[model samples]
Target chain A: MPMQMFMQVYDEIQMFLLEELELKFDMDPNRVRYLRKMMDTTCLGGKYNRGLTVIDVAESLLSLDGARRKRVLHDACVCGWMIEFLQAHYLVEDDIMDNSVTRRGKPCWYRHPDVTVQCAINDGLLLKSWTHMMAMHFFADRPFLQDLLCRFNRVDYTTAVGQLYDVTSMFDSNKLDPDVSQPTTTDFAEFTLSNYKRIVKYKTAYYTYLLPLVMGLIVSEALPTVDMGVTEELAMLMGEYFQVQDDVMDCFTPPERLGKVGTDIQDAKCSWLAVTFLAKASSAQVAEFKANYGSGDSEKVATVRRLYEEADLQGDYVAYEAAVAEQVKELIEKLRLCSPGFAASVETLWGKTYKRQK
Target chain B: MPMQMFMQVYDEIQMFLLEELELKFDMDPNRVRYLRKMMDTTCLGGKYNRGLTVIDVAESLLSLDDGARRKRVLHDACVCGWMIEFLQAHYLVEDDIMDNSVTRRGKPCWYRHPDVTVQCAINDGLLLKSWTHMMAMHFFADRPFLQDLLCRFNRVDYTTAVGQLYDVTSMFDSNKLDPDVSQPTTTDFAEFTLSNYKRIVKYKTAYYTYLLPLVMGLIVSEALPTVDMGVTEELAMLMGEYFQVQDDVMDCFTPPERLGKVGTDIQDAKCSWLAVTFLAKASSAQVAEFKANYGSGDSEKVATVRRLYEEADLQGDYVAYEAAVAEQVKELIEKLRLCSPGFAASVETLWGKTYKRQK
Candidate 1:
């Protein structure tokens, strides 16, 4: 794919989905137009990395030149759009589920003053269908198409299950009865490092890191040619570091800089900071956290921040983040030995994510 | 499918899903089990028509001897169970979205209970996965057999989804606020005469009703090799149309005792038999009466339309319509000249749902 065409992927995806909406609502053309308005804003506005990674990885796999390379790049672009479309499907629904106020520099799809939860629900449904249909259109004749179909659903299956655990922990009815800003179970043991890793791996790991990499692999060549075990472990390392940055930035970075208000602490997410705070806190400090960690009260958040400063979590993370960066480098080094340029693609995935302040 | 084995189908589908859940969650066994709890309550509880159709249509095409009946039928029936139960998984999860439909076979909606919330959305996805997972495990372990089943399964799902989009779009009446104050809109009713409504109903109700299981059965029977493509498409379209009409008929016509409670098609402002039929036939004045009372919030409007139905002798009129559809179906089968008498007899057996008394 041309570097200039990199920007074109998002528009192509939106165009394809609009065409699909037209067919479903052929009798009601305005309905198709309405569907596109929300989808273009929410689905197409995201960073194009997931889509770009598919093209990048696919291009890396082959040495073919001329028209064949261009055709392969065309198919890779199709796979890229499928990945973007899938992301929109999940995000539209998640915005409502998370009670989000805004996303990607705009009012969240459901939070648009005019867009209600109901429209968002069906809009979400449309994206999920369009994702599948897009893949079927470009690759239906290919043998790997079936492989790609099953893989997409499995990715859908895992991400939702991951969200299931996140939402359940976030919204347990008991936690809100006290009207505290806390999550379901305040037991620090539940917020252990192991548990935090599990949630991030399940929730963020597959969709963020593994899905794009695997999708590119699926569209490129024989299934066995790619060693996914290395891909998964590499992504697992990358995802944890990526999400831990999120956890770190939630408290450390100002919300204005991040483009959205940080809610992990307020939502009582099992964020890295929360676990580390619990691990390092003395008994009285622990009591302070239990009372205030999940409290939605602004006063309470200030107190929690004071406790984190006293516990030196930011100071502790400096060392932890350094350790993660080092670990990621070694993995990339070994991966580079096997597939020379492959390391560059994986590095871009990590470097692009690790540098995000938001 | 054996008659006695019908009740056993739900239990077996549950067992398979629980088993699949176990493998996925082997690292956290109980984690996978919670996913199963409400799902079994909702997805597994529905009637097994989707499953049985697969087995019935398959059996009618093949000439299996008595000795092979039990094993073959049971296996075929299980695949049917997997397919239908998969549909139920999505149906229950999706319906819980806002429908909160009071009684699904006399139990509260799964998501309605305080224990569950919108988390049922994920539960819906889990059901979808289990559906594809069951297919992958049983079919994918083989080669194209797995691919064939997926193509068949996915094609059925897309049609069902397309119809659902239409149904939800219809229910979305932007101008109407509260029920009593509401009047069923003119253009909405105008949109549904025969072609428009039937397309929605067929996509929404008919394909799953007829084409999907009908074809799944054909695959199992391995009968498609000798047939022309249009014949099956014709059989499926007519079969689906007739099947959905049964749902429409049972809504207003059947007694509350026959349904779990009083039907809500009138108050729900839905697309059903009474609304479509009245719209299709009513004169200008009669349409005015329908416009006022068609989807009225409560009984004032529905009772008026209900009475209109009675006054028009819709009960008798509907029976004639049903007979003509069946007559059309017979001509379709005969004109196609299928190689087997078993085929037509088997198609007629499907109509026995109406003929045979129900529980």
Candidate 2:
């Protein structure tokens, strides 16, 4: 599949949805226009790595020819776009939960002038419902419809619980009460590596690494033949590495390069950096870190940053990246024995995020 | 199915979900506990009218001969009923958050719990939706019609969501909680017509409340492959509008103790059937009077609108309209009777339940 056709399918799916909103919904032109603008604003402007991976893996796995091949490519692209729809659902709702101001360098959907928080809540839900309609549009007659939908459902539940953990770990009802400044002492105790790994594995790895690859395999009829154990293990490792990269970049990378200012420090997130810092720090430094971390004050943030630099955490991240890459390389080598297509898929996935700046 | 048998399935489904959360997702026990409480709070308090209808319809559609056959059919039908409740819980949880509702089912809303904020409610709503599909995947695992069941859930969910969009957007009133007395413009009053009210009712209230349960029963009984939905679908739409109009009238007339909740439709400037009917049929002076006092929070404004409702005789209009809708439904039931007597019988059974409902 050429990138040209793959890219064009996005617009085609949007048009299909708009037509559906008109016919199935009997929506007026203005409401239809509102949904169209919503799709472009929220669904597009991503890195497209999660979506494009489906096409890449499906292309590598399927050895089809003639009309069947073209149809397979189109179906694979639809699945890929559905993943973006899933992401938009998460982001739109997550923004509201987080009270976010901007996303993808624009105001968040809930923050848009025409959209109330109420409308955005329903809009997020609409994005979710569209995923099924989009799937049924092409894959309704396919035998793997059950498999495909079950996988989406599993991941949807997984990611939502992940968000639940991520939110509850940071903001307890203590901080969420009338006073927003201070939380109970027990809140920060959840920032250990064990909890952090669970959060990343459930939240990032399953959706980003596992869901797309498994979807590709399903679409290409390669799922039964592929080694499930190897796929899950590789996904775990790479998803963790990807999140570690996100944590490092959040603290170290500039807002100009990262596109959004990082809030892990201010929000008291269970980040890999904080977990690692705790693993290496002395009691005094750890106490200082605990007091100064998750503070919204600028000077307090600087104090935490100084502690991070003092511990040479940037150097530590460099070593962590190299270590994760070595682990991924070894797994991909083993993966080739089963399906070189998947080996290439994971290899491509790794290379995209390796040494990434943004 | 017996009422006791139908009620027991709710606990069984809840246990099934908790077990899945532990086994498949490896969810923590505390989180599992949170979900259990959330389920009981949100799912169990409803009247279960939508759910019991599925069982009633499915039971009417399917014939049983012996003890084992009766048990199996009862179980599957109960599962279908529980799935409807799950879907209802999902909508109610999310809708409560959006409406900023204080109480539901005569208690503080689920989101109002000290530990559960709006964020928790949002995620819990997501879990509720996932549970519906999860329930289908488990109970209907080997069934041939699982795909059809899943697709129907998705389709109704989409329609209900679109209905929500129309319902929220049509309200020209500002936030009632944070009122600005300086702004009193009735700019979107023209859009509040009876036609728009039916559109909202048909899409938002009708599909899930009437159509989904009816269709689910057909699917679970494996009657969908033979039965035509065209007449039944039209009948569901009509019944849904009729039922909702009843609710709007009851909101004004019924006491909160009997209704289980107070009506905010007028105070929130909802595009209610009564409001639209008053606009279209009442005198110009009454229309002006309504515009002045419709959305106001003051007790005087509310009482004046109630007085206007009394003078305009919406109660009389509702009784007359109910008769007309019942006639229309009877005709559709006859049309359905030609193709499937059992389903048509079930439709009549539901009509009997809905007709002249007092609470």
Candidate 3:
């Protein structure tokens, strides 16, 4: 039933993008056609899994009444799709800035032969502004909507700040040693995790997990009592676990299943899991890993993966993942003691999130 | 006495720009230093005559009590300065975009330098946002301040729209030219009057000349009775003429006296004075003038000036100038019939604006 609702909401969004919004592109035929293709590919290519999770959570909270459930489902799904669109916007610009050639198994928007770099940036900006306009139109007059809007802006600002910090930090050659023969340093790990946590909390956890479900629960009038801090705490743990699993899968997942090449290590992404492994590695092992993977060379990346395999790091990761899941399960049980209705839906959502791909 | 007040207000603004706002710049050294230099060269270099008109209007409305008058003066001066700053911010970005300039004056801010274009657009965004913050901090607490703020924003937006329309209209090729260009197509006539009027009124008069001073007068309690409709229409016409005369003098005055470069028709600004003269000229005379002066060549500019001298267009402008002054004098007499205490002081402020920039 939730799956059917997700498909319905997805169809409405597809129609809105193709019909209503595309009319604005009438001034330039070439640009309009190119943008139409880009929007179609980027919007339709996503797995729609994040959106379905919103529907599942909304369905559990709201009544089985078809109309009311559909409204809740549609709003939740739109917010989920907005997050996917926001990610696409970021990737389009980041790929241009990073000179990346491909995304989602196709040429990056900026890398397409007909599109110039400047137009790509403008397209990304238009995508960001469209999300705001979408919220204003779709969620207008909903109770607690203003709070939701403010939270969205706050999350966006925080994420932009984190990206600013990340870019600034990475560009400072003084902070990084060119000599990869040296062992991984404590300073590097601390800085990496500090930046990583900020990005994860703002860019991932807030929008991806907390907002979609909280907004759903609020609009459906089934929000848990304000005093129930434990429920929110359990949700945050689940969000963190979901992000950690994502980091793990980015490196481990097959290229076909992932729908794109994985180059997190080569990109020098501030992934929490990467920082954790480095912090725990011995000096000699760290040096070996650096020799293979520290700089952005393909050989180094392959060697770093080999080093992790040799160290049986995947085995260690599995054990750590199980332990964290157990901890979250215990938290869920505690939350259930206070408010089972809220706890059950949240746990069910987490059950699906804990092992998502694509 | 008014000169003393103008000088004092000018010093206060210089301190505000160079000192109070200086602390905020320490965050990003490169941006701060670059913005400061740009503001100094472009913003502070304005004749500052418009800013002084605002203070003159404010003082006329306030009490003789020093404290009350000082408060009014500071507010008026800051508003005038902010208006100019806002215009500069808009133009700086626009000029960069239009010129495809990689550097503004010397250093690139937005669309110029590759590394900082994205960040600089954010800085430009902050520049606009900061103006609102300043307005709220300084003016929002006062009575009727919210209305004043809204009016300022409304007028600013309207003026920008009009300027944009005029700019876009002027850019079209001659085949799309409107029939209004059939009169007064002489260089001196265009430079000194109608062509001068539209650009000054839209870009300068609407906000700098009329709105800022009249709004300042209303806020400072000088023009209370004239606030709604009477004082506004009357003051706008008076300020409009005052700006036209000012633009004329600034164009003709020597650099040492004017404190800036003289205006040039070749700059391709669609000035009102230029448009008016073109409209008034006969078709054959217009064609002769266009061939001699209007096109983009140094020799044509010289021929245009030569023809203007032969036609004695400057003498015609001087006559129109006297007639406009007399017309404003007649309006002042009509304003006195309304008998607001603010009316006389407002006229005095208006007269002071007319006499400004004279050696």
Which TM-score value belongs to model 2?
Answer: 0.93
Model 3 fnat?
0.00
A1-358: candidate 2 lDDT, tens digit per residue: 4567867998888888899888877777767777887878888887888888888888888762367667777878888888889999999988888776777667788877667788789899999998998899888889988999998888888888788777777643224431124343443556778878888888888988998888888888888877788889999888888888888878888766776777788777778888788788898898888788767899889898888889988888889888888888888888888787778987888888788665
Highest-TM-score candidate = 2
lDDT of 2 by residue, B1-359 (tens): 35798878877888888997788776777677777878888888666778888888778877624567556666888898888888888888888888777777677777777667677688888888888888888888898878888888789988999999888777643232121122333454887888778888888889998998899888877788566778889998998988888888887778877777776778877788888988889888998888889886788998889999989998888889988998999899998889788888988888877888865
Error of 1 at A357 (Å): 2.9
Higher-ranked by lDDT: 1 or 2: 2
Q: Note each model's CA RMSD in angstroms.
A: 4.8, 3.8, 11.4
lDDT value for model 3: 0.52
| Per-candidate interface DockQ score | 0.25, 0.36, 0.05
Candidate 1 per-residue lDDT over residues A1-358, each given as its tens digit: 3545755655666666667556653435545555667667765655687888888887887651367666667777877777777788777777766666766556677676555455456567667777766676667678777667777777776677667666655443333221124335656566778767777887777877888888777766734654566777888888887788878877877767666776777777788888888887789998888889766899899899888888888778888878888888988887777666667788878878865754
Better candidate number, 1 or 2, judged by TM-score: 2
Worst 10 residues of 2 chain A by lDDT: A173-182
TM-scores for the candidates: 0.86, 0.93, 0.55
Please provide, for model 3 over A1-358, each residue's C-alpha lDDT reduced to its tens digit, 9 standing for 90 to 100.
6656555765676556545433532112323344456666555676555556556666676642468766776787777766666666666655655455666667777666544443455455445544555565577667655456545544454344334333333333233222112233334544355555555654456556666666556666666452246655655566666777767766777766765566566655556556666767788877776555536677777777776667776777678678767887887787677555666777777777765655
Highest-DockQ candidate: 2
Better of 2 and 3 by lDDT: 2
Error of 3 at A42 (Å): 2.7
Candidate 3's chain A scores what TM-score? 0.81
Which scores better on DockQ, 1 or 3?
A: 1
